[PDB]
Symmetry: none
Subunit: 47 residues, 30 copies
């Protein structure tokens, strides 16, 4: 409609901004959970 | 009639304006009830 | 007669004007009794 | 008689013209009292 | 009669025009009350 | 009598033609008042 | 008439004032019956 | 006559004044019997 | 007349006092029949 | 009757055509509401 | 009227007091139905 | 009817456009909820 | 109407304030339910 | 008398034949006014 | 009587044929309104 | 009845054929959703 | 009298036979109007 | 009465046969809707 | 007189016996017209 | 009277027997409409 | 008079005894028509 | 006259006492016919 | 009047006592129909 | 009245005994529907 | 009542037998769904 | 009212006591469902 | 009942056959997933 | 209530006995699943 | 039906194409998640 | 509102106190589940 398609476009613009907002948290959790593993791995390799 | 068809046209112009008045409430309830769900979903995905 | 048919024509012109006078009350009661129902219906649809 | 049967024929021609004069009032009262009911019925059906 | 059958034909032509006048209100109430439901349904499906 | 039984037969032939004249209005009001209900019922079933 | 049309105008001015008097009760019942539903809905969304 | 037509004119002037005297009672009974019905109708609509 | 118009004025003053006497019963029946309905409605809303 | 049974046959032919008209909407709502669920299910299976 | 508008004001003052009386029950049911859910949620988070 | 089948065709053309409007939101939520999972999976595979 | 559109605007201003009131509870439940999970995750990473 | 009792017997034989002539009109009015009501009743039962 | 009992037997034979005429419409509305529900139920069971 | 029990037998023969029609979809969704899981399981076992 | 009491006894024997003639129509209308309702009720219970 | 109690016994014998006719549909819908669930449950248990 | 008072006593003894003769017809019409209504009422209550 | 109070006692003894005749139909409809619901409820609980 | 006022007192003592005779039928119809409704209501509440 | 005006005054004093004698019967019939209706109304409201 | 206003005051004092008599039944039906619902709700919350 | 208040007290004593009769069914359905759920819950906890 | 309490006792004896009939299905589904899990657990422990 | 607000206060005092009665069941189910999990967790930690 | 207990016995005989049908899949998945592990274990022991 | 609080106490005494019945199964599964692990651990330590 | 079986065939042809569309993603995720593991395994074997 | 925002503030003050109550359990489970791991790690380092 005039309304329903406008509503879905509003919802999609909510969702895309929400996803682009979630990705920094995903990187700073996953990458920091892997550096803390690489450190253990190469520290054990170092000795 | 002169009256009855005029009455139905008055009623239809009442109803269409009422529906176009109700759709903003429907969008701002449904979309805000879905963003509050997408936030939970992608927040759980973020960890 | 000269009188009786004139009397019936007077009566018919009374009655038609009376009916055309009653129809605005009928519209403003019935339509206002239906908008007050459409409002309940679409308000319940809105939530 | 020459008079009494002529009187009854005069009376019958009065009465038939009176009845044919009354029927338009009957239609414009009854039909307008039923359209004002059909309008209520189908207006309630419309919502 | 000459009158009564003419009266019923007048009444039927009133009623059929009244029904064909009521159907647009029925469509614009029912269909707009169902699109407002499909929107909720597929919006919940969208998340 | 010669007259009274003829009068009742005239009245019965008035009445039967009047009833057979009323039945089309009854069908086109009742059936159109039920299709307008079946439409609501199966439209709600459709969603 | 001088009287009957004046009577219908009196009746219409009674009815319109009565309808405009009824609408505040309709709003304060329906809207308060919907806020009490939105509260349940978004409270369940909040957890 | 000099008397009989004067008598009928006296009678007509009695009757017209009597009718114009009766119409206020008719309005204040009928309109007050309809406001007491509109109140019930729109009060039931209000809830 | 001296009498008939006085009689109609007596009748009107009877009728108006009777109507103003009936309205308290109408309010205390209708309003108490609606509070007993609002209580059911909002009690069901309360749970 | 000649009329009533004809009326019921008219009503039945209205209703059957209405049902056969409603079934495409039912399929295109239900099947599209299930493909949108199978997609989620097998997409989660895909990872 | 003097009566009908007074009746609607009485009804509105009934209804508003009834709604303000219902809201404590709504809070003490909904909030106690959500604390009993938060307890389950954070108790499962605690282990 | 002339109206009811036209109403169902209007409803179906509403619904199909609504579904084709909902599918982009479904893809951009589901696919973005799976890439955010593949990233975690292959990031853990990467170390 | 003068009333119905005013009623919907009142309802919308109720609803938007209610949603903006619910979002702090949603953040302080969801974020506190995720920090309590990140703590477990990175505490297990810490050893 | 020879005459008066013969007159009453003539009158009674007039009246009984008149009543037996009236009963078909009574059946074809009443029964046709009830079938037209049963049709409405069971048609509403049919939907 | 000779007439009244014959009239009631005519009325009963009208009514029984009318009921046996209404039952096909009842089956083809109710059963088609239940298959359209079983389809939704078992389609949701199918996924 | 002659009709109602026949209607229920028609409904049961609709339903049983519908269930026997739904079971192939259930098998080809569930079994294909489990082979796609066994493949992952034994592929991880294979390395 | 010899006549009047005999007339009332004739009238009572007319009336009792008429009532015992009306009761089969009452049963076959009411019971068939209730089986057509029980069928709808238990058919909806069946699904 | 002779009639009314016989009518209620007829109605009860209609109803009991209708219920005993509905129970096979209830079993073949409910049990087939549960086997289709047990299959999913134990199929997921099987892997 | 010797005659007139005797005549009135004869008339009163006619009238009292006539009234006591009419009351059985009144009971068997009214009570049978109410049982036929109670049956409809409680039959509708029974379903 | 001798008659009227006897008539009311006859009517009351009709009515009480009618009510005690209706209660078995009420139990065998309501209880059988609830066992058919308990079966669905506990069958869903069983899986 | 000596007679007319005595007649009205006789009539009033007839009427009051008749009303006090009618009230048991009113209670045993209305209360038994409400217990048969409370049973349905709380039986549906019981499941 | 000396007599005729005295006769009319006697008649008026008969009539006024008769009317004041009739009003208690009118109240105890009408009010008892309305309490028996209010009881039904509010008893149905009570459930 | 002396009588009519006294009659309305009698009627109002009947009605107010009747309403104050009905309210205990309304509370003990509605509140007991809601505690039986709160018990189900919080019992399901308890597990 | 002597009757109406006695009728309401009879009705209240019917209703309270009916409610106290319904509560055992409510407990033995709800508690047995929750033990059958606790068993599933703690059986899954047991493994 | 004599009937309503007997009806509730019938309903309770239906329900208790139904629950005692459902518990074997619950045990043979839950226990067989847990042995199939213990087998996996201790089979993995066995290697 | 005197009654309705008293009814809501009765209902609230029912509900609060019911909630304070439900919380011990919630604690003894949830805490015992978590100790049975902590035991598994720390028993696996113990080896 | 005659039906409900027969329905539960049908359901139990469905379920037991379904479980005895699922166990071969469970053995041929679990045992083949353990032989593929014993082979790795004893192959590593072999060197 | 007298019933609802008694029902919750019955439910709590069901649940506590059920939990105290489940704990032996939990110990004899978990402890036997850990001794079978300690045996592997210290057997590998033994060589 | 003509529709329902056609709907299930449409749904099955949706589902099979969806599954055959999902399998390439499953292979390119699982196989690429195993080559990335074989590389680690045989690279550690290579030194 | 005056109530709804107060309700959300009550809910938030419930939730924050609940979270601050849960954190000690989280620390004393997680930290004690990590010291029991550090002990194993450094005990194996000690030999």
């Amino acid at each position: 409609t005039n309304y329903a398609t406008e509503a879905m476009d509003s919802l999609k613009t909510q969702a895309i901004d929400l996803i682009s907002q979630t990705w920094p948290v995903v990187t700073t959790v996953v990458v920091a959970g892997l550096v803390i593993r690489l450190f253990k791995k190469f520290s054990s390799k170092a000795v």
